[PDB]
Paper text:
β2-microglobulin (β2m) and its truncated variant ΔΝ6 are co-deposited in amyloid fibrils in the joints, causing the disorder dialysis-related amyloidosis (DRA). We show that the aggregation of each variant in vitro results in fibrils that are polymorphic, which contain different numbers of protofilaments and different numbers of β2m subunits per layer of the amyloid fibril structure. High resolution structures, however, show that this polymorphism arises from the assembly of a common building block that is strikingly homogeneous and monomorphic.
Residue numbers in the entry:
A (entry chain C), B (entry chain A), C (entry chain E), D (entry chain B), E (entry chain D), F (entry chain F): 6 to 93
Write the structure that this text describes.
Amino acid sequence: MIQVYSRHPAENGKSNFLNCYVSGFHPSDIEVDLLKNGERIEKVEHSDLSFSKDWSFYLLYYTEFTPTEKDEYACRVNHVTLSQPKIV
Amino acid sequence: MIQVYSRHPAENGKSNFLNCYVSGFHPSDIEVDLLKNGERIEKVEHSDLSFSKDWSFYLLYYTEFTPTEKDEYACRVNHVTLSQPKIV
Amino acid sequence: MIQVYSRHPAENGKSNFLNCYVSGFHPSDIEVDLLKNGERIEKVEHSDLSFSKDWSFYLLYYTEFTPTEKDEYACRVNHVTLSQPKIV
Amino acid sequence: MIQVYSRHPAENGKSNFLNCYVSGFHPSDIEVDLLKNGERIEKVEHSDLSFSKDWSFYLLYYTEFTPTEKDEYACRVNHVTLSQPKIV
Amino acid sequence: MIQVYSRHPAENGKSNFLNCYVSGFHPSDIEVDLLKNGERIEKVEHSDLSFSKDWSFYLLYYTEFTPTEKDEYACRVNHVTLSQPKIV
Amino acid sequence: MIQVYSRHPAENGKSNFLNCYVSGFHPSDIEVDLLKNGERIEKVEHSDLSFSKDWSFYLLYYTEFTPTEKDEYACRVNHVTLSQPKIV
């Protein structure tokens, strides 16, 4: 029983990894305005400019939270497994 | 029983990985305005400019959350498995 | 029983890893304003400009939090496992 | 209000003349501009003005470079005269 | 208010003349600009003006570099005259 | 209010002339600028003006560098004259 694993790659260049995993709440480039340039305005009342309310990543009420999760977050992954079982 | 695995690639160049995985709430390039340029305006009242309400990635009420999940997030993945079982 | 693992790669270049894992609440490039340039304004009242309310990453009410999770967060990962069991 | 008074009255024999041998990368008199004269501009986003990325005169992969050359660069220039008199 | 008075009246034999051998990377008279003259500009974001990244004259991978050359650079220039008289 | 009075009246034989052998990386007269003249600008963010990154004349990987050369650089220049008289 012979099991041979040979790996010798040549990477002739530079490697660049950016923003491998992005998730969650990330809004961007949002502009909200009221009366940006205002001239001769008699009255402004009851202006409501609220971007967001309460923030909570995990909100649970009377909950049974039992997840079984195996995860692997990365940019470059190498997984190699050699098995040579012998049973008599 | 002979099991041979030979891998020797040549990568003649540079590699660029960007934004491999994007998910979630990410709105962009949104503009909301009221009376951008305002001249001789007698009255502005009851203006409602709210981008969003409460934020919550996980919201569970009386829930049984039992997911069994194996996941692999990456940009470049290499998975190799050699098996040579012998049973008598 | 012979099990040989040979790995000798050549990386002819520089490696750059940036922002491997980003998550959570990260909003950016958001501008909210009211009456940016204001001239001859008689009255401004009841202005509400609140970006966010209470912040809480984990909020649990009457909850049983029992997750079984094995995770591996990284930029570059190398996982190698050689097994050669013998049973008689 | 933007007022620009730019004048380039006189040029005599500006560049690249009376040369025996010219080669390589020599671009000249190239102008790249975005919003050269701008007034009351609200938002400029995501502008890419990269001229070039990589400069490599010799880039060889698994190559056998054996050029044989005999070159004689013998130019002869006689009685060159450049005159730019200015009288005020 | 921006007022600019720029004048470049006289140039005589500016560059790259009477040369026996010119080679390599020699770009000239290249202008790259963004919003050269700007008034009342609110937001400038994410501007990339990178001219170049990497300068490598000899970049070889697994190469056999054996150039044989005999070169004679013998130019002859006689009686060159440059005159730029100015009278005020 | 920005007022700029810049004048460059006279240049005679500026650069790179009467040279026997010129090579390599020699860019000249390159101007890169962002918002050269700016008034009442609110926000400038994330500006990249990197000219270059890495300068390597000889970059070799697993290379056999055996160049054989015989070069004679013998230029002859006679009676060069540069005159820039100024009378006020």
